[PDB]
Paper text:
Oligomers of the β-amyloid peptide (Aβ) contribute to neurodegeneration in Alzheimer’s disease and are promising targets for therapies against Alzheimer’s disease. β-hairpins are the simplest antiparallel β-sheet, comprising two hydrogen-bonded β-strands connected by a loop. 2AT is composed of β-hairpin peptides that mimic an Aβ17–36 β-hairpin, while KLT is composed of β-hairpin peptides that mimic an Aβ16–36 β-hairpin.
We have now designed and synthesized the covalently stabilized triangular trimer KLT, which mimics a triangular trimer formed by KLM. To stabilize KLM into a triangular trimer and thus create KLT, we mutated A30 and L34 to cysteine to create KLMCC and then oxidized KLMCC in aqueous DMSO to introduce disulfide cross-links. The X-ray crystallographic phases for KLT were determined by first synthesizing a variant of KLT with a para-iodo group on F19 (KLTI) and using SAD phasing to determine the structure of KLTI and then using the structure of KLTI as a search model in molecular replacement. This approach succeeded in determining the phases for KLT because the crystal structure of KLTI has the same space group and unit cell dimensions as the crystal structure of KLT.
Author numbering:
A (entry chain E), B (entry chain F), C (entry chain B), D (entry chain F), E (entry chain E), F (entry chain D), ...: 1 to 16
The structure:
């Protein structure tokens, strides 16, 4: 898997 | 734009 | 305190 | 949105 | 001074 | 190239 | 509060 | 769980 | 050992 | 190689 | 000592 | 110059 940083703008990293 | 580290506790970054 | 990086996934730092 | 780490060398992050 | 992250969107930290 | 935070759980950034 | 990377050169993040 | 930075030296963050 | 982020506040990562 | 963080100011990581 | 980021590629920070 | 991560232990990045 990959650690992905999204941000709806606040940012958060999530493991996918 | 800037990246703010709102940590209001936890820390999240967002721009302005 | 400490700065825990909870991985509940998603990583968030929080002061504990 | 995502944060990409274009490192094309140096590293810079940008969203999509 | 402060280390400030701006991003014209690619991000870069700079000491101000 | 792009730099992805790999995962499989430890995380490493690598070049691609 | 906000978390700023202080500087004066070393950098530290602190709560405000 | 939380992210642990092991020191094997070298530093690897792992989800524990 | 582990790298632990103390909130001595200001964030400082130290070994233990 | 190594990952130098040049502070020419502004911080950029580059593979050297 | 110093924390040096090796590009062993993948980025790994190690002590020296 | 470049950012050096001193290990005094604890880790402080300083502009050198």
């Amino acid at each position: 898997a990959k650690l992905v940083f999204f941000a709806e703008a606040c940012i958060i990293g999530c493991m996918v």
